[PDB]
Design an enzyme around this catalytic site. Sequence first.
Site, PDB file in Angstrom:
ATOM      1  N   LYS A 138      27.401 -29.873   7.144  1.00 16.50           N
ATOM      2  CA  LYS A 138      28.361 -29.969   6.040  1.00 16.50           C
ATOM      3  C   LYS A 138      28.596 -31.445   5.658  1.00 16.50           C
ATOM      4  O   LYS A 138      27.643 -32.120   5.247  1.00 16.50           O
ATOM      5  CB  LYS A 138      29.643 -29.169   6.343  1.00 16.50           C
ATOM      6  N   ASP A 155      37.871 -26.538  15.197  1.00 11.19           N
ATOM      7  CA  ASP A 155      36.599 -26.324  14.522  1.00 11.19           C
ATOM      8  C   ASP A 155      36.547 -27.252  13.315  1.00 11.19           C
ATOM      9  O   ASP A 155      37.070 -26.931  12.246  1.00 11.19           O
ATOM     10  CB  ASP A 155      36.463 -24.860  14.093  1.00 11.19           C
ATOM     11  N   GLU A 191      14.558 -25.117  28.055  1.00 14.51           N
ATOM     12  CA  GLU A 191      15.777 -24.533  28.619  1.00 14.51           C
ATOM     13  C   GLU A 191      16.350 -25.470  29.668  1.00 14.51           C
ATOM     14  O   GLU A 191      15.604 -26.104  30.425  1.00 14.51           O
ATOM     15  CB  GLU A 191      15.495 -23.167  29.237  1.00 14.51           C
ATOM     16  N   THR A 209      29.658 -27.745  12.816  1.00 16.51           N
ATOM     17  CA  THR A 209      28.294 -27.666  12.340  1.00 16.51           C
ATOM     18  C   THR A 209      27.815 -29.086  12.060  1.00 16.51           C
ATOM     19  O   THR A 209      28.622 -30.019  11.922  1.00 16.51           O
ATOM     20  CB  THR A 209      28.197 -26.819  11.069  1.00 16.51           C
ATOM     21  N   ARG A 266      20.717 -28.005   9.743  1.00 17.92           N
ATOM     22  CA  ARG A 266      21.510 -26.811   9.983  1.00 17.92           C
ATOM     23  C   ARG A 266      21.592 -26.502  11.488  1.00 17.92           C
ATOM     24  O   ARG A 266      20.573 -26.291  12.145  1.00 17.92           O
ATOM     25  CB  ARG A 266      20.923 -25.640   9.193  1.00 17.92           C
ATOM     26  N   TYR A 291       9.257 -25.575  24.886  1.00 14.03           N
ATOM     27  CA  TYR A 291      10.326 -24.893  25.633  1.00 14.03           C
ATOM     28  C   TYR A 291      11.055 -25.887  26.526  1.00 14.03           C
ATOM     29  O   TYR A 291      10.437 -26.596  27.329  1.00 14.03           O
ATOM     30  CB  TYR A 291       9.820 -23.695  26.462  1.00 14.03           C
TER      31      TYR A 291
END
Lengths: 405, 405
Positions: B226, B197, B53, B223, B232, B51
């Site tokens: 690609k 984008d 955060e 992303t 991913r 974790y």
Amino acid sequence: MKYLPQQDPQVFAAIEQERKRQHAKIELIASENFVSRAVMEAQGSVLTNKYAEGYPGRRYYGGCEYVDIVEELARERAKQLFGAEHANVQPHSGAQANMAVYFTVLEHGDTVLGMNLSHGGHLTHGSPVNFSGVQYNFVAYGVDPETHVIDYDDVREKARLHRPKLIVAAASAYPRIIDFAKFREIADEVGAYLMVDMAHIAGLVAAGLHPNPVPYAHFVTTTTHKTLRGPRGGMILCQEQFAKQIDKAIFPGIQGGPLMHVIAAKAVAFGEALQDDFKAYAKRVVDNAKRLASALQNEGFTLVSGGTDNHLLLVDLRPQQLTGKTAEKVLDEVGITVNKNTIPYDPESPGVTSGIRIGTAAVTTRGFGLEEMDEIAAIIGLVLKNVGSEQALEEARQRVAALTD
Amino acid sequence: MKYLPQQDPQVFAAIEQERKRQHAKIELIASENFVSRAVMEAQGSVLTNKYAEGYPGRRYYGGCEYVDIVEELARERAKQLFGAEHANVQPHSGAQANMAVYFTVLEHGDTVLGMNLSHGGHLTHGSPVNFSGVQYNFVAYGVDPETHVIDYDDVREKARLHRPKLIVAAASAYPRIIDFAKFREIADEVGAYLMVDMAHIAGLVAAGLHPNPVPYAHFVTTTTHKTLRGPRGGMILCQEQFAKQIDKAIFPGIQGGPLMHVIAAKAVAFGEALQDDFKAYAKRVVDNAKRLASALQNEGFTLVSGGTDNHLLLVDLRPQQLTGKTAEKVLDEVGITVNKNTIPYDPESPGVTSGIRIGTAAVTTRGFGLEEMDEIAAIIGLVLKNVGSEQALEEARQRVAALTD
């Protein structure tokens, strides 16, 4: 690893540091655990290469026959684990699982009733700096100031006063069993949907050690990475009546391509959770937490609610005139990992706090038992009663090392 | 794999099917690629257990020293790749990257101007069944009906008419270079933010083969999976002036715990992209796409915009009296993976379409060159001109197998 050490020495060195850190420290962050090598291998698979928007047998890309098998394995095993009519295993995280449920049943500005964040409610249960509190009008119920148990008459009063469209039950820092039957009764009285966020307790629910929210809730959300001991991600369970709407909320609603490799890892974790040995594990988690609670009380610590029914406990450090921030810092110095955490009716800010949150899921996974719980409590006592003594801290350090081997 | 085959035969068998499928088929889905073994190993690491955060050196959990190194490696390498002042490497996906930018600068109901979805715009650029179109008031600009190039006078007119708070440039199915300078000029005229984008073209941008949006855009989303050929997930780039707001939008705004193992994999992919051989790879992607376009035209196919400047092309199948759905289906029968895709001014529904979308990123990664492009085009011609001939389809099948070995 074979290829990473050669390709990227910098990334590999940092990963190795982290791996060794995970072995060396006493990990008491209540939301953490250690996944199996099988779970990790699934995450490290070629499934990352596959675009699979949509659902099994209903995808928007060809060539999904095999990732469909994987996703269906995840969904069916989840339904077997929790007795739910429908599962959505695509949510990227707890955040996105909750986001999708909100997107399904609420419009912008709708009233939602959740657990007071400083009494145990999560960020995504209405924080004004989180999408939940910005997008929807959150109101809160609290725990009793003495017992620290959820005040169900307060849940009821808040529901009747504010007339929420949705009631959220469940918590990031609540050490007792939640009464989902009462939540549903209140929801029914005011004509609200009930959502249960079981993220923390999901593994305990799977093992029959906490009442199951599924028969009482319209929607159940969860992470896969806490007591469920799976990969990092989210999941939604619901009755067949909401299946289509929930699925549409995840895609095309709030996500795109799912993480098929993570979904594979979810299937693996669910498979592990279905085994008898996982049930034995989960019982040890709860047994260990109760033992740790008792041992800490023996050391003179006050616990929020006076103990625990689950994997986690909250120490109220006011009797020791310590803040959670101070305790977190000094425990870090000796190799014990905890979180500062607000206690109910905390006189301190969230940046300071009067408490520390501790969970046993991770240490139980590494094989810690009752004797280890006694020793952990003893070390915490030694540290927090002697924050100004470097010799005490060094002794603690050695005792921590003795535990992790 | 060592542990998965023993722990979970069902999951392992399906993963193995998928692995073999990825080798056997000619993968022409424009958004797909094949990651390196190093990237996968990073994803399959123990970092899933942590974790974290918050951000490096500013976390809400102790023990993040090493995952901090990893995240900073990702951020710094991203800044080196794209010349951005700030990077946020936490977004779980393209969806969440875009979601966070919208959350940063827009309020519910604000007007946004994006590319017409049936002309090449993405789901998250205003679909009425996606959070973007539900939460914000999207209007659209189009491409010229003849040239199929973005009509910048239409971008300007729509901007001046509707007065959007934000303009979105970039696409999921646009085969030509986007003029970011003109988008910024229009944005400046109407006092709108510009978001680009670059998900599809990110690897090409990194390789200097497509103009870089970073100097022109307030926010750049992408992303990592690609043309960038990474794991991913998502990423946001922006100038230092928006860094704090963007970071807060991701957390505590729209996400919780980041996927540290995926972030490690991002660092690895960015490291690979910084290498000279990635530049050579990306040039081959573009060269291959141009060659494939020319070869398809030689077979008698009409291409949207008359060719390509990037990794992808769109076949307008109207001259062959075929729908995209029909072409997608029959190509699937012979081992060629494409998407049906709407063409600009498509007379067909999105469920049927008059086009197929093809990209060369994946086949280039597996070592395909110009000769292979000629053969792929020849096979597509053979199939689409003989949809009713099982012997033609069997010949195609054998020629596909010949290519994949």
